[PDB]
Design a protein around this ligand. Structure first.
Ligand SMILES: *Cc1cc2c(cc1C)nc1c(=O)[nH]c(=O)nc-1n2C[C@H](O)[C@H](O)[C@H](O)COP(=O)(O)OP(=O)(O)OC[C@H]1O[C@@H](n2cnc3c(N)ncnc32)[C@H](O)[C@@H]1O
Ligand SMILES: *Cc1cc2c(cc1C)nc1c(=O)[nH]c(=O)nc-1n2C[C@H](O)[C@H](O)[C@H](O)COP(=O)(O)OP(=O)(O)OC[C@H]1O[C@@H](n2cnc3c(N)ncnc32)[C@H](O)[C@@H]1O
Lengths: 577, 577, 52, 104
């Protein structure tokens, strides 16, 4: 292991991989460190649901997700257990137990917020939804020129869509998808538009979708190698990056202090450029542990020397959720073009349609699928083929409905009573609200309590702001109740509800971007460079300073691409030696 | 891809890897197929709990286990959901839904039986307990010579323990471990012996234990390689092995038919030797798909041509479980040697002991750990150090207590109310009973219903036998209640209970061993060779024909070692040319 | 049910259960205040919670 | 079959029923408050021995019904509260409130 690199990247999630793809491919000698380890098969950092076993039983994948989410801040537990035996040891107080954080006010938390420490970060389990932000959700890249701003965003998004292999066509011939899409299109004719959720994925077969991940962006293989003989890249897993060392003038980073978790050794690693892509919480922790912002409980009478906005203006989306069970009317519509003769299971049972007839309400391919299912499976009471893919429907955020929507299926933990309902009938509804950035909403770090890696313990001070955020969040729940009813009634056990704050994991604004440090209350400029520092960049959702409803990864990636362009103009790659 | 080898092995679990280690090492050209894929990191087939992240947060590992256990047979669901909206499509019958098996009687099932399809099989997540069977639980290898039989078992188990890196010392300096060990030792003085559970694991540091797996046994890297330039081995993941082809005389296997799940291609693989190590359920399924035993619901009027005992005499252990919260008496005993002056948090707080003093209850190393925890963490009300390892205690099966015992901790999902209890206080209790082999207890395969891989669907017909099995099961429950009370009272929410049948996953006897096919109602001989067939061997817990309570893997491995000795004496490795 | 309808708990400590899935528009407490006949004198770990 | 085993609790001065001077109940009376723990020593040992005895004795009749596994009940759910105004021969010597005629 060398002492000296051109570029060091902290974190191997999709944003770290965006920096790696750009900088490795432009000839820089790059090292990337991740506190977590390789565990996605031979494709390093790839999507864990791309195994044949998970494509066959998607519902088991929820356990993979839960297995790699570690709660950020867990308040001291105050549950009374008063049925212990009189011989068991019993507390006299609610003391600090089981990794809980005594700094945490349980009523001002993001209890759902969690982090993932594996190579490839959260992109080894994510849902892969990559919509663009419209103007109202999107940070400015060009001031006082809307057309140049639009064109810069379109350029960046288009490259990012390339890196993720985003597409809107992978579910085009699913009967359920089209059944839902067409009904909502009709119901909202001239009011709202519906389309497929943009998904980072490529269909390989009618029963296999290769979901994208960090690996799609950059394969994380050491270079040079055979396919890439001129490139230079080393990945170091199980390495905790602990701090960047500031020079006395606060104008440059001099090294990156690391702790090898296998060997136990500590090093100082030196590079021309330091990139932090450790996620929205862990970028902030690393910065704070390096003397940026303020350690300990916020004190507005003792302002921090550096980046006073760091860890303020934090945003997290409101999320509402329910599931539905498809209406009788919709289910009967699936077989509207069929002529049915006889009795199921008998010899003279016949299901037929006339292909191409003008009276047919469905296309030939749909009718063929339905006829074959009904004919080959006469014991089954539903017209939807067993292997029909799930719906993947959205109407994107607009000013008259300012929430993102997903009307679809992902991995779900059904209760035994719910497993009673045929899976083909079930549709998930998830509406995501935007949250106004407010100075009082903070992520801070204890000066006494430490986490499992002996770093200052993250603590939230968060409430959904009064005013627009709150009114919109409740209007959003109503909208889901109204819209979902057009498809079917709620599934018992999955009734309309707000999710635990932060369970969405779309945390933003912890190290937010803007044009001017003071005027825009921010930490990085539009090249993602830390103000004042020549050689320190941050990537990820923590850069996004706006109120957004849509899934933010694609936007973070777009910013990271722009960041790499600055880097490419301002730093010279070492010569191949 | 070659289609010709000396030895082909179906399954990459620890039993498949026992054959690979032996036969690759003896110079055979070996191929191994697994229907599952590589996903344990760069160490192929290794234990998934070996990451730093799981060493720090062990309770999250329960999710990893659940994500790779697929239920074998789920009966048709009859739960009534009668609060759907009137508009939702609603069933008139409890029709076949959601992969359920209409052949399965819900009251004669092993509902908790599940399989894992991943490289390394279940040894990627297992608890690593590897006790030997005493005579009463163990199949005979030598008839009418108890001493020779003991000597042969000792030789085999010794080699098996070396392969797994079994030890009884990895937890010797845990305070919690010794606290429990010494108390049970005292309480049962003269009546029962206690020791550490024998574990397949190597301690690397005070906070890291490297758990063994299939990888420990055999590293599963393609050979030849730098480290083994004269060996020959190829692993082929995502390949469903479907049938072995019998010759007309039923004396030899002629090929293995396989299905590549990625490409969709089918091949006939040729070998001199065919080894089936697909697990107790799937070995049986592959054999039945190949014309052994009987397909469909058992029909005694229509005897199977081959291996009529295949799928009969199946055994599964009864399992009782509770948790306890350590007694005040035991907790106070942890600090019995301490002198405490003043009160915690203050300046004059002192905790001291006298090293080597003859009136001390505890060794110096224990007193020093207690002393330092209490002095450095004066806010904490317990004398047990935060990183103190868990107990790993057993009293092994004996005639006067015919069940295996584990008094320990492994992966567990605590309810929010239980998370209220400090984890240092909690001990898990699991006692495993032996189940008599009975002809009527059967694993059979449907001739109409198929599973997720289009293979005949497994169906159980099982009840715990009346008589000794049942009486001993209830006596075991009582023994757990009596013995756990000596350590502490039950933890609310983990009260003494039988676990769902088969959730233990120690299924045996599906393709059982004996001396004589007819007289011993069995499928393989003591070399694990299928009767009548020169070149077909079965490995795994399915071979074990006895009633056993101890964890069976180490025993199955020992049988596979003996099987390899036969193969090495009867088959010649091809010339490495 | 007859029994439960005429058993009134003697001393119920202040409730500290966290409900954090209220809608943002709903009135939300800042503290665990004295609510619903709870007794702030009561140490929840030194109670007879079942006494009625 | 239901199994209920009831243990005896040593009377200890520190175990108290008292009444708030500020909080009031539904009848506007001083709010009762407990300060109670099962005493260490004999009470606690017997309680746990009692649990074990129920596990051993019940097994002779049948195994446990799932959902009604052996458990201690919430303290006081039993409603056999005693000693709040206790009898004895001598007020000071026997730490008591009424005599053997139940007279205060
Ligand atoms: C979990 C989740 C997330 C998710 C989702 C569904 C689930 C269940 N669905 C999404 C969706 O459909 N659309 C979308 O845009 N995002 C979705 N997500 C969130 C998404 O996965 C994240 O936004 C994205 O992965 C963030 O990428 P980024 O690269 O910034 O961060 P990361 O993936 O968390 O990776 C961070 C890496 O850093 C390592 N780390 C952390 N601390 C350190 C230190 N100190 N030293 C070295 N490395 C560190 C972590 O191990 C991690 O690998
Ligand atoms: C899950 C589990 C298991 C377990 C345990 C705790 C848990 C939660 N604790 C144990 C303990 O402490 N002590 C012990 O002895 N065992 C414990 N176990 C059970 C143990 O893991 C199993 O007994 C053991 O792994 C069995 O090994 P074996 O090699 O015989 O079988 P396997 O691990 O199931 O691997 C089978 C492989 O075969 C592949 N397969 C299945 N079907 C096919 C087909 N048709 N074609 C090709 N390959 C096939 C599977 O994918 C699997 O990988």
């Amino acid at each position: 292991m060398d002492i000296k690199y051109d570029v060091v990247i902290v974190g191997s999630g999709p944003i770290g991989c965006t920096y790696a793809r750009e900088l490795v491919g432009a000839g820089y000698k790059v090292a990337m460190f991740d506190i977590g380890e390789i565990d996605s098969g031979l494709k390093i950092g790839a999507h864990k649901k791309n195994t044949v076993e998970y494509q066959k039983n998607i519902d088991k994948f929820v356990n993979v997700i839960q297995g790699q989410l570690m709660s950020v801040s867990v308040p001291v537990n105050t549950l009374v257990v008063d049925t212990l035996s009189p011989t068991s040891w019993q507390a006299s107080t609610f003391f600090v137990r089981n990794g809980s954080n005594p700094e945490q006010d349980p009523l001002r938390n993001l209890s759902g917020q969690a982090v993932t420490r594996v190579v490839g970060g959260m992109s080894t389990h994510w849902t892969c939804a990559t919509p663009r932000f419209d103007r109202e959700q999107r940070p400015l890249l060009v001031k006082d020129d809307a057309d140049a701003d639009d064109a810069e965003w379109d350029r960046l998004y288009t490259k990012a869509e390339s890196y993720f292999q985003t597409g809107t066509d992978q579910f085009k011939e699913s009967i359920r998808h089209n059944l839902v899409l067409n009904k909502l299109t009709e119901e909202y004719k001239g009011q709202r538009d519906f389309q497929q959720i943009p998904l980072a994925a490529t269909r390989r077969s009618p029963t296999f979708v290769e979901w994208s991940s960090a690996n799609t962006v950059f394969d994380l293989q050491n270079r040079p190698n055979t396919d890439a003989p001129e490139e230079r890249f080393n990945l170091f897993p199980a390495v905790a990056c602990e701090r960047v060392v500031r020079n006395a003038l606060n104008s440059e980073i001099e090294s990156l202090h690391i702790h090898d978790l296998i060997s136990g050794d500590r090093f100082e690693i030196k590079a021309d450029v330091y990139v932090l892509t450790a996620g929205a919480v862990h970028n902030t922790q690393l910065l704070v542990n390096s003397g940026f912002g303020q350690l300990g409980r916020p004190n507005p009478a003792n302002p921090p020397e550096l980046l006073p906005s760091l860890g303020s203006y934090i945003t997290e989306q409101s999320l509402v959720f329910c599931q539905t069970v498809m209406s009788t009317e919709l289910i009967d519509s699936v077989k509207s073009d069929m002529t049915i003769r006889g009795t199921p299971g008998e010899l003279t049972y016949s299901v037929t349609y006339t292909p191409g007839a003008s009276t047919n309400k469905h296309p030939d391919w749909w009718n063929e699928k339905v006829k074959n299912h009904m004919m080959q499976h006469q014991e089954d009471p539903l017209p939807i083929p067993f292997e029909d893919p799930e719906p993947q429907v959205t109407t994107l955020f607009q000013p008259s409905h300012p929430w993102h929507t997903q009307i679809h299926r992902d991995a779900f933990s059904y209760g035994a009573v719910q497993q009673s309902i045929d899976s083909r009938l079930i549709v998930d509804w998830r509406f995501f609200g935007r949250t106004e950035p407010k100075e009082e909403n903070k992520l801070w770090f204890s000066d006494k309590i430490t986490d499992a890696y002996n770093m200052p313990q993250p603590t939230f001070d968060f409430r959904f702001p009064a005013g627009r955020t709150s009114k919109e969040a409740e209007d959003m729940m109503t909208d889901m109740c109204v819209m979902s009813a057009k498809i079917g009634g709620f599934l018992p056990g999955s009734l309309p509800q707000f999710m635990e704050p932060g369970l969405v994991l779309h945390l933003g604004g912890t190290h937010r971007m803007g044009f001017d440090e003071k005027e825009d209350n921010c930490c990085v400029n539009t090249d993602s460079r830390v103000f004042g520092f020549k050689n320190l960049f941050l990537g990820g959702c923590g850069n996004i300073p706006t109120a957004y409803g849509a899934n933010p990864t694609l936007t973070a990636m777009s910013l990271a691409i722009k960041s790499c362009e600055y880097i490419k103009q301002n730093f010279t790659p070492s010569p191949f030696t």
